[PDB]
């Protein structure tokens, strides 16, 4: 009869015939990932083509139901998700050109091999040939050579391709009733129709600038401290008044500063909290690592893993004969099938990764009651944030003492807390200006604020202004320096890391307040607290049914993303850095004072 | 007295194939001796929920006829086989009366009814114009009309085929794994009751 009943029956018909197809596609993808063989690639491609064709046919059928005559929020959300054209609105010639451009960028990034001129007989790929050199070398000219050579080859190949890519994506976005591709990416956080909890696409940029303005003093003090330590490491290259050289940040692009912990350690004399040797001595298998993670999740009140998880997951490297992707990934295959694909070693990093991926599995399990097209996170930030909170809680010394991995007579003084907080800042705080600058640059490129002939002159100007990182030598417009990174070259949103970082500490403050922790925020553990698990599970069970603003109200009691929990987390480090920066100069100059 | 001619519970529980939930099999059991303790003492059943009678006194009471309804549903849909429930199975596939006397026995059948490619032989009625009456069987395969437009026989837009297949894989979760359900319905009618329990000596 009515349009709403028709849409509800159509959505039931969709969820039923779409869960099985998604399960077939996901199972084929799993069979490819655990067994890299050409027939498995063909089966994956066939399943993906069937899934995509089915989604195209259902979207074509779905558009015939007008949105304004439906009042139920869940039905409207599923219909909005299904009715998006995507690339279908673009012409077939341009769509094929766009797909070809995406595939060739994927091949250029994945199979890009660069080595030194005059010695071309063998060359090194980015992983792991160049990663180890960027993360471990202490030589100025070697890192400069690797950085400049990789940006020369990759940027000169990718610059016309990116110029075509921006135009095609803008054409698709304006054809899809968006201002630009940046508006399309910002539409993930768009909430419409809920009174008070509405969020606009234009509000995201303003909120990001407002939060970053409060991030900036902590980052400036951290930058000054890192500058002083790198000045100690490299005597003449780094200037006291200028920016950091780009090739000295410990990674290829500057995404993380976690490779500078050895150079920038506050108290080298004091021990670390490494628990690897303790697991090696007690013969901790990967199965024990996942069982301890399961014990952590049952301690907080969440459901334990299914029998199918233990039977069907690959938690150890299979062997020489069978090839598998080594990257840790949590798979929600559909129909209640949850698996973890991780090549788990006996390390602290793998243990924390196991907690992170099992957090992803818990998040996926929680919204299994929801309809199929609403089985996702409320935004792109929450899904990663719920794993990062488990990574935060598991890494605490109280958790390590509780599970027996750390000695009960281990002395927790202020110095160990300072160096641990500095490592967490280099991993977490250091990525925030780079992420914000990269997303703002891409948004201005998509919006047309930056013409194609002025992309790099603005970009380095942005990097000096925001990140405080200077180019080693000037680059002209023949270079394509942003696209050397994995996420930008393969059409991925990058603001998820910024939102994830803020949501991580907001959730951590909310759960620690729920768990009645009475000390510093970084010393808080959410184990043994049923109420904290209940508060988390209230948001976890919703999935994408409710707005992310309402979910954030459910957890932290705020209607907007907030920056204060992060600053509260790093407050001991902030006081220590302010004390240590009396002689040195906080802040940087955008001029070419160190080197150009 | 020495008792023989036991009731055929082997042909219901240990059947090689079970029916679909839309076309659930009904077997009338009469004029024999029904030993219910073999079923109750089995550890092979996941659900043994009895409504209106207790399992302990089943072996003493006598009934006129026993109706054994057999079908296959999902793990998450076993809860809907109860009086007063709402769902796809209760409204459109198998409806139980509120005044029901009998037992609902369900067990996991992932070993037999799931294959690696997918077992699609089990179908369920997804749409019907009106809810089913208790103990009604609908085997009609007429196109469901969700919109005023005349369907005209073809499955196009707003007109759907009511019987949708089920997908059974051995790696599925416990809420999606196939569960064989046998519902025993006990009624007492004015005729002399012939399905009596065994008499202990
Ligand atoms: C992986 O593929 C090979 C190819 O023949 C096959 O023999 C083997 O059984 C497969 N292993 C798994 C775990 O799927
Ligand atoms: C929206 O539809 C779902 C099922 O499709 C229903 O359970 C829910 O109550 C509806 N919400 C409102 C506000 O009517
Ligand atoms: C998708 O594209 C079709 C054809 O170009 C158009 O009719 C439809 O309105 C588009 N969808 C939306 C949500 O605008
Ligand atoms: C998961 O929890 C349930 C109840 O808490 C328990 O019966 C079951 O044995 C647990 N699973 C495992 C593998 O321990
Ligand atoms: C650590 O605590 C001791 C004891 O009060 C104090 O003397 C020292 O300055 C503190 N150091 C830091 C870095 O907080
Ligand atoms: C949490 O519960 C377990 C189970 O008894 C216990 O061994 C552990 O010590 C508890 N955690 C803390 C911090 O007391
Ligand atoms: C049915 O099968 C089970 C398991 O194979 C067997 O133990 C039982 O005796 C059979 N018969 C009945 C009436 O349950």
In order of A203, A552, B174, the CA distances from A506 in angstroms are 19, 9, 35
Which residue's alpha carbon is nearest to atom 12 within ligand 2? Answer: A72
A404 φ/ψ angles, rounded to the nearest 5 degrees: 90, 0
* Spacing, Cα A355 to ligand 6 middle (Å): 17
What residues contact A28, with CB distance under 8 A and at least 6 apart?
A40, A43, A44, A46, A47, A48
> Is residue A80 domain-shared with residue A119, that is, in the same domain?
no
Q: Are A242 and A588 in contact (CB under 8 A)?
A: yes
Which of the 8 DSSP states describes residue A83? T
Q: Which helix (H) or strand (E) holds A113?
A: strand A113-114
Q: Provide the 3-class DSSP secondary structure of residue A523.
A: helix
Angle value at C-alpha A557, between A555 and A559, nearest 5 degrees: 105
* Nearest residue in chain B measured CA to CA from A6: B146
Which of the 8 DSSP states describes residue B153? T
A133 φ/ψ angles, rounded to the nearest 5 degrees: -65, -45
Distance, in Å, from the CA atom of A71 to the CA atom of A3, rounded to the nearest integer, reads 10
B72 φ/ψ angles, rounded to the nearest 5 degrees: -125, 130
> Is residue B67 domain-shared with residue B111, that is, in the same domain?
yes
* Ligand of minimum distance to the alpha carbon of B39: 7
B window 119-158, beta carbon within 8 A of A: 126-127, 146-148, 157-158
Mutation pick for ligand 3 pocket among A67, A82, A89, A92 (CB with most ligand atoms within 8 Å): A89
> Is residue B34 domain-shared with residue B12, that is, in the same domain?
yes
Residues forming beta bridges with residue B2, ordered by sequence position: none
What residues contact A280, with CB distance under 8 A and at least 6 apart?
A346
> Is residue B28 domain-shared with residue B80, that is, in the same domain?
yes
Sort strands A124-125 and A113-114 into parallel, antiparallel or unpaired. Answer: antiparallel
Q: What is the resolution of this structure in A?
A: 3.5
Cβ burial, residue A185 (10 Å; 0-12/13-18/19+): buried
> Is residue A75 domain-shared with residue A43, that is, in the same domain?
yes
Range of the domain at A69: 3-84
In a domain, A111, yes or no: yes
**Token digits for A263?**
């150079």
Give chain B's length. Answer: 201
In order of A50, A110, A309, A321, A354, the CA distances from A35 in angstroms are 21, 20, 18, 10, 21
Q: Provide the 3-class DSSP secondary structure of residue A485.
A: coil
> Is residue A67 domain-shared with residue A112, that is, in the same domain?
no
* Spacing, Cα B112 to ligand 1 middle (Å): 24
State how far residue A393 is from chain B, nearest Cα, in angstroms.
Answer: 29
Residues forming beta bridges with residue B105, ordered by sequence position: B48, B182
Strands (E), chain B: 25-29, 47-51, 62-63, 65-73, 102-108, 123-125, 144-145, 159-160, 163-165, 179-187, 195-196
> Is residue B27 domain-shared with residue B108, that is, in the same domain?
yes
Distance, in Å, from the CA atom of A84 to the CA atom of A173, rounded to the nearest integer, reads 11
Distance, in Å, from the CA atom of A26 to the CA atom of A23, rounded to the nearest integer, reads 5
> Is residue B29 domain-shared with residue B91, that is, in the same domain?
yes
Which has the closest alpha carbon to B34: B53, B52, B58, B51? Answer: B58
The DSSP string of A188-240 is GG-B-SSSS--B-HHHHHHHHHHHHHHHHHHHHHHHHHHHHHHHHHSTTTS-S
Distance, in Å, from the CA atom of A361 to the CA atom of A495, rounded to the nearest integer, reads 23
Range of the domain at B151: 117-169
The DSSP string of A371-425 is -GGG-S-SSHHHHHHHHHHHHHHHTSHHHHHHTTSS-TT----HHHHHHHHHHHH
The 10 Å Cβ neighbour count of residue A175 is: 15
What residues contact A114, with CB distance under 8 A and at least 6 apart?
A123, A124, A130, A149, A150, A153, A154
> Is residue A102 domain-shared with residue A158, that is, in the same domain?
yes
Sheet holding B25-29, edge to edge: B25-29, B65-73, B179-187, B102-108, B47-51
Q: Are A434 and A254 in contact (CB under 8 A)?
A: yes
- Which of A139, A165, A191 is where one domain is finished? A165
Q: Provide the 3-class DSSP secondary structure of residue A317.
A: coil
> Is residue B91 domain-shared with residue B174, that is, in the same domain?
yes
Q: Provide the 3-class DSSP secondary structure of residue A482.
A: helix
Cβ burial, residue A366 (10 Å; 0-12/13-18/19+): buried
> Is residue B78 domain-shared with residue B134, that is, in the same domain?
no
Torsion of CA B131, B132, B134, B135, to 10 degrees: -160
Which has the closest alpha carbon to A216: A546, A480, A466? Answer: A466
Check chain B for breaks (C–N over 2.5 Å) and list the residue before each, or none.
none
Distance, in Å, from the CA atom of A532 to the CA atom of A554, rounded to the nearest integer, reads 12
Which has the closest alpha carbon to A21: A53, A65, A66, A69? Answer: A53
> Is residue B165 domain-shared with residue B175, that is, in the same domain?
no
What residues contact A596, with CB distance under 8 A and at least 6 apart?
A470, A471, A472, A473, A474
Distance, in Å, from the CA atom of A442 to the CA atom of A171, rounded to the nearest integer, reads 16
> Is residue A9 domain-shared with residue A79, that is, in the same domain?
yes
CB contact under 8 A, A17 and B164: yes
Cβ burial, residue B126 (10 Å; 0-12/13-18/19+): buried
A375 Rama class: left (phi>0) / alpha (psi -120 to 50) / beta:
beta
Distance, in Å, from the CA atom of A432 to the CA atom of A412, rounded to the nearest integer, reads 29
Structural domain count of chain B:
2
A496 annotated as ligand-binding: no
> Is residue B98 domain-shared with residue B125, that is, in the same domain?
no
Sort strands A244-245 and A469-470 into parallel, antiparallel or unpaired. Answer: parallel
* Nearest residue in chain B measured CA to CA from A338: B173
CB contact under 8 A, A20 and B174: no
What secondary structure, in 3-state letters, does A14-33 show? HHHHHHHHHHHHHHHHHHHH
CB contact under 8 A, A61 and B148: no
- CB of A402 shorter than 6 A to ligand 6: yes
Structural domain count of chain A:
3
Buried b (16+ CB within 10 A) or exposed e, B130-147: eebeebeebeeeebbebb
**Token digits for A117?**
């001129």
- Asked, as a colleague might, if the bond just before A346 is cis with ω within 30 of 0, I would say no
In a domain, A545, yes or no: no
* Ligand of minimum distance to the alpha carbon of A576: 5
Distance, in Å, from the CA atom of B104 to the CA atom of B182, rounded to the nearest integer, reads 6
- CB of A418 shorter than 6 A to ligand 5: yes
State how far residue A198 is from chain B, nearest Cα, in angstroms.
Answer: 33
Residues forming beta bridges with residue A244, ordered by sequence position: A469
- Which of A443, A458, A489 is where one domain is finished? A489
> Is residue B73 domain-shared with residue B135, that is, in the same domain?
no
Which has the closest alpha carbon to B13: B96, B69, B81, B90? Answer: B69
B chain contacts of residue A21, beta-carbon cutoff 8 Å: none
Buried b (16+ CB within 10 A) or exposed e, A462-487: bbbebbbbbbbeebeeebbbbbbbbb
CB contact under 8 A, A335 and B176: yes
CA-based R_g, chain A, Å = 25
Q: Provide the 3-class DSSP secondary structure of residue B30.
A: coil
Q: Are A124 and A153 in contact (CB under 8 A)?
A: no
What secondary structure, in 3-state letters, does A487-516 show? HHHCCCCCCHHHHHHHHHHHHHHHHHHHCC
* Ligand of minimum distance to the alpha carbon of A290: 4
Residues forming beta bridges with residue A207, ordered by sequence position: none
In a domain, A129, yes or no: yes
**Pure H helices in B9-52:** 10-13, 37-40
Which of the 8 DSSP states describes residue B176? T
Which has the closest alpha carbon to A444: A212, A189, A209? Answer: A209
Which of the 8 DSSP states describes residue B134? T
* Nearest residue in chain A measured CA to CA from B173: A336
């Amino acid at each position: 009869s009515t349009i709403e009943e028709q849409a509800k029956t159509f959505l039931d018909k969709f969820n039923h015939e779409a869960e099985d197809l998604f399960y077939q596609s996901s199972l084929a993808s799993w069979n490819y990932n655990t067994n890299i063989t050409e027939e498995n690639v063909q089966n994956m491609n066939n399943a993906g083509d069937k899934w995509s064709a089915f989604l195209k046919e259902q979207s074509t059928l779905a558009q015939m139901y007008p949105l304004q005559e439906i009042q139920n929020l869940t039905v409207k959300l599923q219909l909005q998700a299904l009715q998006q054209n995507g690339s279908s609105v673009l012409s077939e010639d341009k769509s094929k050109r766009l797909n070809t451009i995406l595939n060739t960028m994927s091949t250029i990034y994945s199979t890009g091999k660069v080595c030194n001129p005059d010695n071309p007989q063998e060359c090194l790929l980015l992983e792991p040939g160049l990663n180890e050199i960027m993360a471990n070398s202490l030589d100025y000219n070697e890192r400069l050579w690797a950085w400049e050579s990789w940006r020369s080859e990759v940027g000169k190949q990718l610059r016309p391709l990116y110029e075509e890519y921006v135009v095609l994506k803008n054409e698709m976005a304006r054809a899809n009733h968006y201002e630009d591709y940046g508006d399309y990416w910002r539409g993930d956080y768009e909430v419409n129709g809920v009174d008070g909890y509405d969020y606009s696409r234009g509000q995201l940029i303003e909120d990001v600038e407002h939060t970053f303005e409060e991030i900036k003093p902590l980052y400036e003090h951290l930058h000054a401290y890192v500058r002083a330590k790198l000045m100690n490491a490299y005597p003449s290259y780094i200037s006291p008044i200028g920016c950091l050289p780009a090739h000295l940040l410990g990674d290829m692009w500057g995404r993380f500063w976690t490779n500078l912990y050895s150079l920038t350690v506050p108290f080298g004399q004091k021990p670390n909290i490494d628990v690897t040797d303790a697991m090696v001595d007690q013969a901790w298998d990967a199965q024990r690592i996942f069982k301890e993670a399961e014990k952590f999740f049952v301690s907080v009140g969440l459901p334990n893993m299914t029998q199918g998880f233990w039977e069907n997951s690959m938690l150890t490297d299979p062997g020489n004969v069978q090839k598998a992707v080594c990257h840790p990934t949590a798979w929600d295959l559909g129909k209640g099938d949850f698996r973890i694909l991780m090549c788990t070693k006996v390390t602290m990093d793998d243990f924390l990764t196991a907690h992170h991926e099992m957090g992803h599995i818990q998040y996926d399990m929680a919204y299994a009651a929801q309809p199929f097209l609403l089985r996702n996170g409320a935004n792109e930030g929450f899904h990663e944030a719920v794993g990062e909170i488990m990574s935060l809680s598991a890494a605490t010394p109280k958790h390590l003492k509780s599970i027996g991995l750390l000695s009960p007579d281990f002395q927790e003084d202020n110095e160990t807390e300072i160096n641990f907080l500095l490592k967490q800042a280099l991993t977490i705080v250091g990525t925030l200006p780079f992420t914000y600058m990269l997303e703002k640059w891409r948004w201005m490129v998509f919006k047309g604020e930056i013409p194609k002939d002025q992309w790099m002159k603005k970009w380095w100007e942005m990097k000096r202004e925001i990140v405080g990182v200077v180019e080693p030598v000037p680059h002209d417009e023949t270079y394509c320096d942003p696209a050397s990174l994995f996420h930008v070259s393969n059409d991925y949103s990058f603001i998820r890391y910024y939102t994830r970082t803020l949501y991580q500490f907001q959730f951590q403050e909310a759960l620690c307040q729920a768990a009645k922790h009475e000390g510093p925020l970084h010393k808080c553990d959410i184990s043994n607290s049923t109420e904290a698990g209940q508060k988390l599970f209230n948001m976890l069970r919703l999935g994408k049914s409710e707005p992310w603003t309402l979910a954030l109200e459910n957890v932290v009691g705020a209607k907007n993303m907030n920056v204060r929990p992060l600053l509260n987390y790093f407050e001991p480090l902030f006081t220590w850095l302010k004390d240590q920066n009396k002689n040195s100069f906080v802040g940087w100059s955008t001029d070419w004072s160190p080197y150009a | 007295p020495n008792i023989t001619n036991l009731c055929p519970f082997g042909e219901v529980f240990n059947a090689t194939r079970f029916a679909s939930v839309y076309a659930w099999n009904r077997k009338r059991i009469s004029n024999c001796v029904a030993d219910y303790s073999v079923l109750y003492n089995s550890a092979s059943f996941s659900t043994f929920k009895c409504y209106g009678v207790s399992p302990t006194k089943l072996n003493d009471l006598c009934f006129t006829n026993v109706y054994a309804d057999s079908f296959v549903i999902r793990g998450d849909e076993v809860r809907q086989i109860a009086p007063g429930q709402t769902g796809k199975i209760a409204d459109y596939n198998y409806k139980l009366p509120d005044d029901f006397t009998g037992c609902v026995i369900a067990w996991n059948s992932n070993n037999l009814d799931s294959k690696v490619g997918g077992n699609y032989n089990y179908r369920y009625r997804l749409f019907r114009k009106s809810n089913l009456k208790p103990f009604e069987r609908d085997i009609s395969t007429e196109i469901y009309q969700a919109g005023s437009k005349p369907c005209n026989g073809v499955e196009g837009f707003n007109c759907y085929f009511p019987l949708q297949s089920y997908g059974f894989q051995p790696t599925n979760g416990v809420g999606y794994q196939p569960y064989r359900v046998v519902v025993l319905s006990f009624e007492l009618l004015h005729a002399p009751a012939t399905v009596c329990g065994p008499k202990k000596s």
